[PDB]
Design a protein around this ligand. Structure first.
Ligand code: NI
Length: 341
């Protein structure tokens, strides 16, 4: 059964609600982004209207085989009418194709559903500038002040400088980057650009990347592993055993691996600056954990909400424990008292 924080009242609509069977009263299913916890339940046998971005609809058709007649892609930043209700899709600064959804209810209530997002001051000059929001359905993944991490630009600067130094010292070093979903593509793209290489990967990952509307992508990626010195591997293989095994397969072309595991937040963030980050090393293999986040930090979240001034907040993450719920409610009231709304 579909939980209340996935339903939009006063409409026939649900958000990220594909794992509950036929939801009673649902006339249109929205999908914010192509991450498995959110698309869980979709497949080629789905026969209700799915509303999403262009990029998400490429992934639904090619990767999950959803039939074309049920995929309804909407342009971003554009007022659209869906089953009698005005909606807008906005860029969520999450993974490729990820959106927030503005719903203009027939009674005059305005609802923002963030999906998954990384809040940014640039959102203060989107179509959100123009009107009041009554209800906020909020990605609360990192809603506690201990969750700090650097800008994506600082993290990419560290990765590029680290990879370029290693491979210039040793032209026979291979770089490997872990992946298990879409998102975080700038990590491997930026490193391959500084090294003058295409990125090598499996046919299944190449397929996925070809759905993302990335400019000049044919110039940037390949399935010919032998021609490339930056390889993508599943995240599960980013350990000493998996990497050893991979280096054997390369036929003595390489004699060292430098590997990156983009994580979200980890508790080594509480003590170390990005500049000071060191790898785990065994023999000729080194593994860096890098805190590349596609969700808001505590401070980015708090700024966005204090700017938007919603009348009510409904969290969409960390909703399963009383302690998490009570913590989030306390911070919402602090923010409201500090800012005066
Ligand atoms: Ni996500």
């Amino acid at each position: 059964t579909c939980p209340f924080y996935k339903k939009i009242p006063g409409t026939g609509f649900t958000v990220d609600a594909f794992q509950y069977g036929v939801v009673e009263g649902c006339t249109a299913y929205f999908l914010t982004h192509f991450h498995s916890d959110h698309y869980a339940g979709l497949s080629k046998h789905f026969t209700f209207p799915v509303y999403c971005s262009e990029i998400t609809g490429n992934l639904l058709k090619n990767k999950l085989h959803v039939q074309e007649q049920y995929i309804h892609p909407l342009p971003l930043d554009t007022e659209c009418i869906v089953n009698g209700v005005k909606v807008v899709l906005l860029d969520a600064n999450h993974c490729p194709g990820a959106v927030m959804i503005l719903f203009y209810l027939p009674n005059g209530t305005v609802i923002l559903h963030t999906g998954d997002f990384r809040a940014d001051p640039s959102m203060e000059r989107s179509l959100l500038a123009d009107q009041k929001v009554h209800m906020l359905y909020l990605d609360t993944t990192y809603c506690s002040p201990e969750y700090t991490f650097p800008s994506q630009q600082e993290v990419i600067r560290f990765a590029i400088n680290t990879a370029f130094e290693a491979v210039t010292l040793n032209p026979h070093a291979l770089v490997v980057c872990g992946t298990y979903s879409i998102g975080k593509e700038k990590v491997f793209l930026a490193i391959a650009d500084v090294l003058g290489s295409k990125v090598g990967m499996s046919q299944e990952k190449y397929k996925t990347l070809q759905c993302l509307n990335i400019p000049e992508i044919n110039s940037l990626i390949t399935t010919d592993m032998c021609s490339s010195l930056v390889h993508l591997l599943p995240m599960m293989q980013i350990n000493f055993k998996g990497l050893q095994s991979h280096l054997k397969k390369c036929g003595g072309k390489y004699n060292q691996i430098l590997a990156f595991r983009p994580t979200g937040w980890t508790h080594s963030n509480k003590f170390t600056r990005i500049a000071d980050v060191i790898p785990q090393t065994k023999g000729n293999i080194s593994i860096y954990g890098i805190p590349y986040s596609e969700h808001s930090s505590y401070l980015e979240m708090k700024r966005f909400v204090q700017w938007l001034k919603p009348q009510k907040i409904i969290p969409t993450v960390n909703v399963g424990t009383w302690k998490s719920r009570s913590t989030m409610e306390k911070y919402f009231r602090e923010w409201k008292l500090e800012a005066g709304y």
